[PDB]
Amino acid sequence: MKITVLVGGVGGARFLLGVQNLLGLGSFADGPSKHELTAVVNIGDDAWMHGVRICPDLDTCMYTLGGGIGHRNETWNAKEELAAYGVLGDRDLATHLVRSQMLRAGYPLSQVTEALCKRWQPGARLLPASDERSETHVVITDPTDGERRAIHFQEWWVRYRAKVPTHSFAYVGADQATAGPGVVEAIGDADIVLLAPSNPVVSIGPILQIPGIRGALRSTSAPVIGYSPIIAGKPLRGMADECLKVIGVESTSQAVGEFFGARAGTGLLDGWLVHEGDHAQIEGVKVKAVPLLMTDPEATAAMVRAGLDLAGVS
Amino acid sequence: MKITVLVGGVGGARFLLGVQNLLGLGSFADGPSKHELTAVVNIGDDAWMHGVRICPDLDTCMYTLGGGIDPDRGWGHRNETWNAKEELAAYGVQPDWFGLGDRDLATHLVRSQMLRAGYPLSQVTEALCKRWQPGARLLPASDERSETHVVITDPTDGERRAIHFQEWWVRYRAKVPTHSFAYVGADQATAGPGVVEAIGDADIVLLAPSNPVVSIGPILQIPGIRGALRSTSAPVIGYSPIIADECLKVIGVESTSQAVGEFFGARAGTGLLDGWLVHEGDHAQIEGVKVKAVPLLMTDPEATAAMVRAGLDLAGVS
Ligand SMILES: C=C(OP(=O)(O)OC[C@@H](O)[C@@H](O)[C@@H](O)Cn1c2nc(=O)[nH]c(=O)c-2cc2ccc(O)cc21)C(=O)O
Ligand SMILES: [Ca+2]
Ligand SMILES: [Ca+2]
């Protein structure tokens, strides 16, 4: 009755909704449930900004599973004034103010998250991958002086991506971080561990740079089942993932599967799901093609079922 | 050439509008500015709230002189929304009684980020004023902490507690048994950059008709500021706030121009005033202080411009 999922980005949050739909959790509950879902949540996008601590992946899971997905009725008047001062919705800022106060009074991020969830009641345990800072950065050639300069991922994404040469990612602080409370336990004790179809480099990937988490994944007796984020069939055949490009990995199910690789070798996957019509073959890894479009929590629920079935879990 | 005004509250800001209009400064400018205006701004109401630093008197002056103030309220931003406040309420946090508007929050966010990065309040204020262009130099009375505290009897339990001015004024509206004010940090607070110099080098110093106990009084508790006032060569002219009642009660001062004037007292003795302006039809007689009754209603920037002219004329300054 124990599922743990590694997640980041909007697609991680939508994947969790499907897990809840399958298992009758949170907004999809009728009578209080038998199963428990644990999300190990990317912190690589987290940043101190305008004096406040912003945790995007934790907030997106929390709002999404809490029914508040940014927000509804959102205004950006504070954001407007900030631009007028020459430098983030109004409701969003409330979350940031409360979190920053708890962090400055010594609550770890895992406890901060738990406190915020009393109000959102997401119906899942949302564990930060670490309580220490581990901030994804991007090394660019800065055009002002031609220097290789490390930029926070959120600034790269909005300002520099596709406009300057981009060389690599750096996980600033990962080496000094430890797995957050309960993370290693959630991975070791699960009936099954799922890699949600998030960006492999900057949503799942940074979770894997936190000392201890890759070890737990390699050694856990739980089946580890990954979901491909590559969807073929779009108009003009889609576009390559920009973050995979930075590390020179093609935007294919085959290439992302080898990125995680096989637990039987030195990698992370027992199972790899690809979208219908797609193909991959990876020694030691059971690959299966099934619908992987998160149209709605009901279609995501079928996706989660395919992962359980592939892993032989009830 | 040089005017220094001590200010606190909405009335301080409006008095500063009167000065600018008289002298062609800020939004009232038409042609080259001949004068410079410096405000020494109370910091006694400043509080940390929800992790950000609120400086109400500095913001009231900045917003008013820069055209962003709310007219109905006299504090905070115009065209304000309260979505972040409502959301704070939905999280069930305290304090739930201080109004932190969305637009106003940006000011507090920038200020707090700068203060925590090591910038002193005077430079933060200068940074924020690059956007508002108030047309006056807004000097925090101190860059250090000096906060007004209130000793009350708590109604929940009949115990004596001390609370910040903000809880007294906004949360209880002073409807609680109140026994004394305490200027915590005043004795340890150095006069802020430029403050003593602006008082020493002024052609005239004006005491705005702000709250005498909680707006002008706290500035006087900063040890260097009161000293500069006693020794500056400039005439010091005060404006009666009586034409606030709770604050005078707590300290046992009657609510009259004569009494408030004596609260500040005469420079000739141990006081601070050279002169004292009261509303027309008011008589006040204080030894060593030239008193003149003139219209003292800050109806509009040139009603006040005329109030300022009467102050210069009482001082004999041109
Ligand atoms: C009357 C005089 O003094 P003064 O006008 O400062 O009174 C206190 C108040 O204005 C100020 O200290 C502050 O409290 C005003 N003020 C609020 N006042 C309220 O009553 N309720 C509120 O929610 C509220 C929120 C708020 C937020 C930011 C801010 O910068 C000021 C704010 C005078 O000297 O002439
Ligand atoms: Ca509460
Ligand atoms: Ca000091």
XYZ file of C-alpha atoms and ligand atoms in Angstrom:
669
model
C 0.000 0.000 0.000
C 3.128 2.200 -0.209
C 4.021 4.136 -3.375
C 6.861 6.634 -3.611
C 7.368 8.859 -6.645
C 10.292 11.086 -7.633
C 8.797 14.284 -9.110
C 9.435 17.770 -10.409
C 7.773 20.317 -12.639
C 4.152 20.521 -13.776
C 4.206 16.961 -15.079
C 5.295 15.506 -11.770
C 2.324 17.134 -10.070
C -0.062 15.804 -12.728
C 1.430 12.342 -12.376
C 0.797 12.439 -8.599
C -2.846 13.327 -9.273
C -3.085 10.106 -11.270
C -1.560 8.063 -8.452
C -4.149 9.559 -6.101
C -6.902 8.836 -8.618
C -5.868 5.188 -8.830
C -5.548 4.789 -5.053
C -8.460 6.943 -3.849
C -6.341 9.638 -2.138
C -6.839 13.350 -1.484
C -9.455 15.019 -3.675
C -10.347 11.610 -5.176
C -11.138 9.924 -1.855
C -14.548 8.514 -0.951
C -13.848 6.585 2.250
C -10.485 7.024 3.985
C -7.942 5.028 2.057
C -5.693 1.984 2.450
C -2.662 3.271 0.523
C -0.057 5.944 1.212
C 1.724 8.007 -1.414
C 5.075 9.667 -0.851
C 6.565 12.201 -3.249
C 10.292 12.946 -3.225
C 10.223 16.491 -4.605
C 12.949 18.307 -6.573
C 14.489 21.322 -4.837
C 16.874 22.290 -7.666
C 14.618 25.200 -8.742
C 14.431 26.633 -5.219
C 15.782 30.145 -4.805
C 16.049 33.082 -2.436
C 14.442 35.916 -4.424
C 13.390 39.390 -3.289
C 14.196 38.391 0.295
C 11.858 35.390 0.211
C 12.395 31.648 -0.296
C 10.562 30.285 -3.368
C 10.126 26.488 -3.717
C 8.458 25.903 -7.117
C 8.203 22.112 -7.287
C 6.990 21.770 -3.691
C 4.403 24.530 -4.289
C 3.141 23.068 -7.597
C 2.572 19.628 -6.061
C 0.972 21.236 -3.000
C -1.396 23.552 -4.937
C -2.145 20.912 -7.579
C -3.056 18.181 -5.111
C -4.777 20.712 -2.874
C -7.017 22.022 -5.626
C -5.538 25.508 -5.920
C -3.824 25.320 -9.324
C 0.110 29.319 -10.017
C -3.264 29.965 -8.352
C -6.824 30.776 -9.231
C -7.924 34.403 -8.888
C -4.245 35.377 -9.029
C -3.062 38.980 -9.287
C 0.447 40.242 -10.032
C 0.262 43.679 -8.483
C 3.231 43.110 -6.186
C 5.158 41.874 -9.218
C 4.186 45.064 -11.070
C 5.467 47.346 -8.281
C 8.708 45.365 -8.118
C 9.274 46.056 -11.821
C 8.603 49.754 -11.103
C 11.423 49.586 -8.550
C 13.661 48.252 -11.328
C 14.376 44.611 -10.467
C 5.275 35.675 -8.225
C 1.586 36.256 -7.848
C 0.194 38.130 -4.881
C -1.375 34.962 -3.419
C 1.811 33.049 -4.184
C 3.768 35.598 -2.155
C 1.715 34.697 0.916
C 3.118 31.159 0.753
C 6.633 32.616 0.391
C 6.291 34.964 3.335
C 5.088 32.189 5.644
C 7.779 29.747 4.527
C 10.575 32.308 4.897
C 9.513 33.112 8.470
C 9.601 29.441 9.428
C 12.988 28.995 7.770
C 14.446 32.008 9.570
C 13.079 30.725 12.895
C 14.868 27.413 12.293
C 12.260 25.073 10.907
C 13.710 22.774 8.233
C 12.064 22.847 4.810
C 10.510 19.409 5.396
C 8.722 20.796 8.469
C 7.873 24.023 6.623
C 6.214 21.956 3.898
C 4.270 19.904 6.423
C 2.972 23.096 8.056
C 1.831 24.581 4.739
C 0.021 21.328 3.906
C -2.262 21.618 6.940
C -4.049 24.246 4.879
C -3.820 22.595 1.436
C -4.272 18.977 2.651
C -2.816 17.566 -0.559
C -3.450 13.963 0.499
C 0.176 12.939 0.000
C 3.439 13.176 1.878
C 5.552 15.788 0.070
C 9.172 15.325 1.154
C 11.779 17.812 -0.079
C 14.622 15.823 -1.623
C 16.853 17.635 0.879
C 16.596 20.183 3.653
C 19.919 21.629 2.511
C 20.290 24.006 -0.413
C 20.968 22.209 -3.698
C 20.275 24.725 -6.467
C 20.442 23.794 -10.130
C 22.612 26.227 -12.064
C 23.538 26.545 -15.739
C 27.053 27.460 -16.918
C 26.931 29.947 -19.830
C 29.286 32.155 -21.769
C 28.274 35.563 -20.408
C 28.178 37.971 -23.388
C 29.207 41.023 -21.306
C 32.746 39.654 -20.791
C 33.013 36.212 -22.429
C 33.391 34.445 -19.066
C 31.898 31.074 -18.241
C 29.471 32.059 -15.491
C 27.091 29.906 -13.444
C 23.486 31.165 -13.500
C 20.520 29.959 -11.474
C 18.271 27.684 -13.521
C 15.243 30.015 -13.236
C 17.231 32.927 -14.613
C 18.728 30.774 -17.381
C 15.288 29.480 -18.369
C 13.678 32.900 -18.678
C 16.560 35.073 -19.864
C 19.551 33.208 -21.308
C 18.171 29.934 -22.726
C 18.720 29.857 -26.510
C 20.409 33.261 -26.521
C 23.968 32.502 -25.313
C 26.180 29.412 -25.441
C 25.230 27.004 -22.646
C 27.825 24.503 -21.483
C 26.612 22.385 -18.543
C 24.547 22.211 -15.385
C 25.982 22.571 -11.903
C 24.172 21.397 -8.763
C 25.338 24.095 -6.351
C 25.393 22.643 -2.849
C 24.502 19.060 -3.732
C 27.847 17.775 -2.477
C 27.174 19.363 0.920
C 23.551 18.108 1.146
C 21.975 15.010 2.662
C 18.772 13.191 1.823
C 15.885 14.927 3.532
C 14.072 13.330 6.461
C 12.259 10.159 5.458
C 13.431 10.235 1.815
C 15.817 7.279 2.088
C 13.192 5.403 4.104
C 10.429 6.160 1.585
C 12.640 4.672 -1.144
C 13.686 1.602 0.854
C 10.235 0.746 2.226
C 8.043 1.355 -0.826
C 6.171 -1.396 -2.579
C 7.208 0.389 -5.780
C 9.165 3.505 -6.779
C 8.173 5.532 -9.831
C 10.126 8.118 -11.828
C 7.430 10.533 -12.979
C 7.617 11.723 -16.625
C 9.424 14.959 -15.758
C 12.412 16.555 -17.375
C 15.184 14.007 -16.714
C 18.021 16.547 -16.361
C 16.435 19.311 -14.282
C 13.375 17.720 -12.619
C 14.340 14.130 -11.766
C 18.096 14.531 -12.333
C 18.822 16.994 -9.503
C 17.059 14.715 -6.988
C 19.661 12.126 -8.007
C 22.582 14.465 -7.181
C 21.688 14.577 -3.476
C 24.095 12.320 -1.544
C 22.281 9.196 -0.391
C 19.330 9.217 -2.791
C 21.055 7.461 -5.682
C 22.321 4.878 -3.200
C 18.828 4.214 -1.833
C 17.467 3.873 -5.390
C 20.147 1.433 -6.480
C 19.795 -0.803 -3.458
C 16.070 -0.710 -2.685
C 14.258 -4.025 -2.988
C 11.288 -2.114 -4.432
C 10.880 -2.252 -8.221
C 11.875 1.073 -9.835
C 9.724 1.972 -12.845
C 10.468 5.024 -15.001
C 8.143 6.916 -17.321
C 9.417 8.495 -20.523
C 8.813 12.261 -20.886
C 9.272 12.015 -24.686
C 5.989 12.122 -26.625
C 6.344 11.582 -30.374
C 3.631 12.483 -32.892
C 3.306 16.249 -32.347
C 3.004 18.688 -35.265
C 6.328 19.174 -37.082
C 7.574 16.224 -34.988
C 7.931 18.377 -31.853
C 11.164 19.984 -30.633
C 14.216 18.600 -28.862
C 14.328 19.154 -25.113
C 16.577 22.129 -24.453
C 17.985 20.768 -21.195
C 18.824 17.372 -22.712
C 20.589 19.246 -25.512
C 22.883 20.983 -23.003
C 24.209 17.582 -21.927
C 24.131 16.224 -25.498
C 21.397 13.619 -25.034
C 18.947 13.100 -27.861
C 15.243 13.638 -27.221
C 14.214 9.994 -27.574
C 12.799 7.366 -25.251
C 15.831 5.193 -26.075
C 18.289 7.952 -25.055
C 16.513 8.994 -21.849
C 16.199 5.348 -20.842
C 19.964 4.928 -21.188
C 20.435 8.178 -19.273
C 18.870 6.540 -16.216
C 20.211 3.144 -17.286
C 19.606 -0.308 -15.852
C 19.741 -1.260 -12.183
C 21.094 -4.588 -13.460
C 24.138 -2.623 -14.625
C 25.069 0.643 -12.888
C 21.833 2.535 -13.558
C 18.466 3.111 -11.980
C 15.637 1.397 -13.900
C 13.988 -1.965 -13.643
C 11.210 -0.846 -15.976
C 10.748 1.893 -18.579
C 7.373 2.889 -20.002
C 7.194 4.552 -23.411
C 4.245 6.151 -25.185
C 2.198 4.014 -27.613
C 3.960 3.570 -30.943
C 7.400 4.296 -29.418
C 10.306 1.885 -28.933
C 13.330 1.372 -26.720
C 15.601 -1.535 -25.893
C 17.955 -1.329 -22.918
C 19.807 -4.355 -21.609
C 18.412 -5.387 -18.248
C 15.315 -3.169 -18.497
C 11.759 -4.225 -19.233
C 10.370 -1.701 -21.772
C 6.658 -1.453 -22.557
C 4.733 0.917 -24.834
C 1.394 2.179 -23.514
C -0.476 5.515 -23.580
C 1.566 8.046 -21.569
C -0.461 11.231 -22.119
C -1.627 12.805 -18.860
C -4.844 14.078 -20.429
C -6.695 13.851 -17.116
C -6.375 12.045 -13.775
C -8.263 9.083 -15.248
C -5.775 8.698 -18.102
C -2.907 9.203 -15.655
C -4.421 6.506 -13.408
C -4.221 4.063 -16.331
C -0.583 5.074 -16.780
C 0.142 4.323 -13.099
C -1.612 0.946 -13.451
C 0.640 0.053 -16.378
C 3.633 0.672 -14.130
C 2.305 -1.521 -11.322
C 1.540 -4.290 -13.830
C 4.986 -4.092 -15.447
C 6.532 -4.391 -11.971
C 4.260 -7.214 -10.802
C 2.854 -5.230 -7.864
C -0.708 -5.316 -6.469
C 17.852 77.738 0.489
C 17.627 75.013 3.186
C 14.553 73.860 5.166
C 14.506 71.008 7.689
C 11.195 69.610 8.907
C 10.610 66.946 11.557
C 7.728 64.701 10.513
C 5.646 61.693 11.476
C 2.311 60.370 10.189
C -0.095 61.481 7.445
C -0.017 65.075 8.665
C 3.752 65.173 8.355
C 3.505 64.159 4.705
C 0.807 66.734 3.999
C 2.856 69.433 5.744
C 5.750 68.472 3.458
C 3.448 68.968 0.465
C 2.782 72.496 1.696
C 6.514 73.202 1.884
C 7.211 71.883 -1.620
C 4.366 73.941 -3.061
C 5.598 77.119 -1.378
C 9.131 76.507 -2.683
C 8.385 75.006 -6.111
C 9.749 71.520 -5.289
C 8.832 67.998 -6.318
C 5.487 67.755 -8.102
C 4.894 71.502 -7.597
C 8.026 72.511 -9.495
C 7.870 75.033 -12.318
C 11.409 75.946 -13.274
C 14.754 75.697 -11.543
C 14.633 74.672 -7.899
C 16.176 77.321 -5.641
C 15.641 75.463 -2.344
C 16.370 72.066 -0.866
C 13.973 70.396 1.581
C 15.046 67.815 4.164
C 12.663 65.758 6.280
C 13.784 64.045 9.486
C 11.338 61.160 9.617
C 10.222 59.305 12.730
C 11.238 55.644 12.837
C 9.438 54.823 16.109
C 6.484 53.137 14.295
C 8.774 50.767 12.270
C 8.012 47.084 12.843
C 8.962 43.684 11.514
C 5.708 42.084 10.348
C 5.512 38.707 8.609
C 9.276 38.809 8.061
C 9.399 42.179 6.267
C 10.342 45.600 7.607
C 7.483 48.152 7.559
C 8.581 51.815 7.830
C 5.209 53.656 7.949
C 6.352 57.300 8.330
C 9.044 56.980 5.639
C 6.544 55.255 3.275
C 3.798 57.797 4.041
C 6.165 60.644 3.110
C 7.610 58.829 0.084
C 4.186 57.776 -1.252
C 2.543 61.140 -0.596
C 5.281 63.310 -2.132
C 5.614 60.844 -5.048
C 1.892 60.681 -5.781
C 1.268 57.060 -4.805
C -0.512 57.408 -1.452
C -4.047 56.301 -0.798
C -6.269 59.372 -0.325
C -9.015 57.659 1.667
C -6.639 56.080 4.195
C -3.577 58.334 4.205
C -1.304 55.272 4.476
C -0.198 52.602 2.012
C -0.517 52.483 -1.738
C -3.243 53.730 -4.061
C -5.340 51.256 -6.095
C -4.466 48.596 -3.550
C -5.448 44.931 -3.576
C -5.329 42.624 -0.555
C -4.978 39.155 -2.076
C -1.773 38.341 -0.201
C -3.383 39.503 3.051
C -6.462 37.346 2.425
C -4.164 34.419 1.617
C -2.183 34.985 4.827
C -5.516 34.894 6.647
C -6.395 31.620 4.869
C -3.184 30.080 6.192
C -4.421 31.080 9.677
C -1.358 33.077 10.709
C -0.774 36.040 13.052
C -0.783 38.922 13.108
C -4.055 38.942 11.147
C -4.719 42.610 11.989
C -2.031 44.571 10.072
C -3.038 45.490 6.522
C -0.218 44.486 4.133
C -1.436 45.412 0.658
C -0.163 43.769 -2.507
C 1.359 46.896 -4.071
C 2.701 48.060 -0.724
C 4.307 44.635 -0.186
C 6.801 45.323 -3.019
C 8.184 48.239 -1.019
C 8.559 45.987 2.037
C 10.120 43.184 -0.051
C 12.795 45.455 -1.540
C 13.504 47.140 1.792
C 13.846 43.840 3.679
C 16.085 42.215 1.069
C 18.335 45.293 1.188
C 18.443 45.563 4.978
C 19.343 41.876 5.250
C 22.084 42.365 2.686
C 23.718 45.015 4.858
C 22.308 48.262 3.433
C 21.452 50.878 6.070
C 17.947 52.274 6.109
C 19.074 55.653 4.755
C 20.429 54.074 1.544
C 17.413 51.787 1.231
C 15.176 54.857 1.435
C 17.351 56.583 -1.167
C 17.094 53.503 -3.374
C 13.291 53.369 -3.069
C 13.062 57.132 -3.703
C 14.794 56.760 -7.095
C 11.407 55.437 -8.215
C 9.076 57.826 -6.366
C 11.144 61.037 -6.909
C 9.578 62.735 -3.855
C 11.468 65.963 -4.449
C 12.638 66.025 -0.819
C 15.435 64.377 1.116
C 13.770 61.807 3.407
C 16.169 61.086 6.281
C 15.320 58.287 8.725
C 15.813 59.756 12.207
C 18.182 56.823 12.766
C 19.539 53.890 10.807
C 19.410 51.890 14.078
C 16.339 50.446 15.819
C 14.306 52.801 18.013
C 10.756 51.535 18.388
C 7.924 53.023 20.395
C 6.384 50.565 22.866
C 3.211 50.882 24.909
C 2.585 49.546 28.422
C -1.023 48.327 28.713
C -3.266 46.235 30.907
C -4.107 43.191 28.801
C -7.905 42.720 28.696
C -7.649 38.931 28.323
C -5.945 38.516 31.691
C -5.536 41.861 33.486
C -1.760 41.561 33.271
C 0.617 44.385 32.402
C 2.220 43.799 29.013
C 4.238 45.919 26.632
C 3.208 45.906 22.977
C 4.553 47.613 19.903
C 2.899 50.930 18.829
C 1.424 49.052 15.786
C -0.467 46.561 17.980
C -1.678 49.384 20.225
C -2.847 51.622 17.376
C -3.996 49.201 14.664
C -5.131 46.176 16.662
C -6.594 47.818 19.770
C -7.139 51.328 18.321
C -5.852 52.425 21.777
C -9.067 51.037 23.340
C -7.087 49.306 26.064
C -5.978 50.659 29.481
C -2.714 52.403 28.593
C -0.140 53.500 31.166
C 3.046 54.741 29.500
C 5.118 54.916 26.337
C 8.631 53.469 26.175
C 11.223 54.478 23.538
C 13.132 51.228 23.363
C 16.515 51.664 21.711
C 16.353 55.505 21.564
C 19.392 55.907 23.938
C 21.340 53.335 21.915
C 20.394 54.814 18.502
C 22.837 57.085 16.677
C 21.501 60.013 14.674
C 21.108 58.895 11.081
C 23.426 60.068 8.301
C 22.853 63.738 7.484
C 20.387 64.305 10.311
C 22.468 66.437 12.690
C 23.944 68.317 9.720
C 20.498 69.035 8.225
C 19.414 70.469 11.566
C 22.641 72.386 12.105
C 22.867 73.887 8.616
C 19.183 74.643 8.074
C 17.930 78.184 7.524
C 14.832 77.189 9.492
C 13.687 74.012 11.229
C 9.968 73.279 11.342
C 8.163 70.873 13.688
C 5.247 69.552 11.628
C 1.761 69.368 13.247
C 2.078 65.568 13.632
C 1.339 63.483 16.716
C 3.437 65.146 19.468
C 3.938 61.958 21.556
C 4.161 59.153 18.940
C 5.315 61.085 15.822
C 7.500 64.094 16.813
C 8.362 62.994 20.406
C 10.192 59.715 19.387
C 12.567 61.688 17.071
C 13.430 63.907 20.110
C 14.430 60.744 22.121
C 17.337 60.091 19.685
C 20.138 61.673 21.813
C 21.960 63.437 18.975
C 18.835 64.882 17.345
C 17.589 66.703 20.439
C 21.098 68.084 20.912
C 21.339 69.427 17.362
C 17.970 71.150 17.812
C 19.034 72.917 20.992
C 22.279 74.215 19.485
C 21.446 74.853 15.815
C 21.630 78.481 14.698
C 18.344 78.099 12.828
C 15.086 79.393 14.323
C 12.945 76.431 15.410
C 9.221 76.877 14.749
C 6.550 74.417 15.852
C 2.999 73.896 14.542
C 0.215 72.909 16.982
C -1.560 69.651 16.139
C -4.592 70.890 18.160
C -7.174 72.997 16.332
C -3.629 61.845 19.277
C -5.989 62.809 22.058
C -5.340 59.362 23.595
C -1.524 59.810 23.456
C -1.678 63.123 25.322
C -3.972 61.543 27.910
C -1.514 58.722 28.619
C 1.241 61.217 29.373
C -1.124 63.556 31.212
C -0.891 66.555 28.886
C -4.060 68.519 28.273
C -5.321 68.540 24.676
C -4.609 72.211 23.845
C -2.088 74.284 21.817
C -0.888 75.921 25.027
C -0.207 72.494 26.646
C 1.410 70.844 23.600
C 3.535 73.968 23.144
C 4.752 73.670 26.730
C 5.392 69.969 26.107
C 8.057 71.065 23.600
C 8.937 74.123 25.660
C 11.117 77.139 24.960
C 14.659 77.070 23.612
C 15.315 80.070 25.859
C 14.821 77.760 28.831
C 15.275 74.000 28.469
C 12.775 73.555 25.621
C 13.019 73.402 21.868
C 10.758 76.062 20.317
C 11.490 79.554 19.169
C 7.915 79.941 17.952
C 4.547 78.241 17.913
C 1.716 78.556 15.380
C -1.876 77.812 16.467
C -5.252 77.914 14.655
C -7.008 81.276 14.377
C -9.238 82.006 17.354
C -6.807 80.196 19.636
C -4.823 81.928 22.343
C -1.698 80.390 23.795
C 0.923 82.123 25.875
C 4.271 80.423 26.598
C 7.292 82.316 28.012
C 10.196 82.750 25.565
C 8.133 81.601 22.569
C 6.603 83.921 19.982
C 3.045 82.599 19.435
C 0.946 83.473 16.377
C -2.558 82.299 15.470
C -3.111 81.661 11.748
C -5.251 79.216 9.718
C -3.730 75.799 10.508
C -6.063 73.492 8.521
C -4.084 71.508 5.945
C -7.000 71.541 3.500
C -4.771 71.370 0.435
C -1.137 71.983 -0.530
C -1.534 75.772 -0.726
C -3.606 76.113 2.422
C -0.481 74.518 3.947
C 1.882 76.527 1.741
C 0.322 79.523 3.492
C 0.830 77.809 6.855
C 4.509 77.419 6.010
C 4.802 81.061 4.962
C 3.407 82.127 8.330
C 6.134 80.011 9.942
C 8.943 81.674 7.994
C 7.399 85.074 8.739
C 7.205 84.273 12.453
C 10.887 83.282 12.321
C 11.923 86.322 10.277
C 13.589 84.070 7.642
C 13.619 84.764 3.892
C -1.804 60.274 13.212
C -0.415 60.432 13.079
O 0.346 59.276 13.109
P 0.207 58.057 12.052
O -0.609 58.456 10.873
O 1.519 57.415 11.801
O -0.617 56.912 12.767
C -0.163 55.563 12.627
C -0.314 55.040 11.228
O -0.530 56.075 10.276
C 0.908 54.251 10.766
O 1.828 54.037 11.804
C 0.434 52.922 10.196
O -0.108 52.143 11.222
C -0.612 53.126 9.105
N -0.966 51.809 8.571
C -2.073 51.161 9.025
N -2.933 51.791 9.864
C -4.074 51.200 10.313
O -4.815 51.778 11.066
N -4.342 49.934 9.890
C -3.547 49.207 9.047
O -3.879 48.083 8.734
C -2.334 49.862 8.591
C -1.445 49.229 7.735
C -0.306 49.861 7.305
C 0.594 49.246 6.421
C 1.716 49.885 6.001
C 1.986 51.164 6.425
O 3.006 51.741 6.047
C 1.085 51.824 7.309
C -0.064 51.163 7.742
C 0.255 61.662 12.835
O 1.369 61.803 13.309
O -0.331 62.536 12.161
Ca -3.418 29.186 13.167
Ca 23.454 51.629 18.523
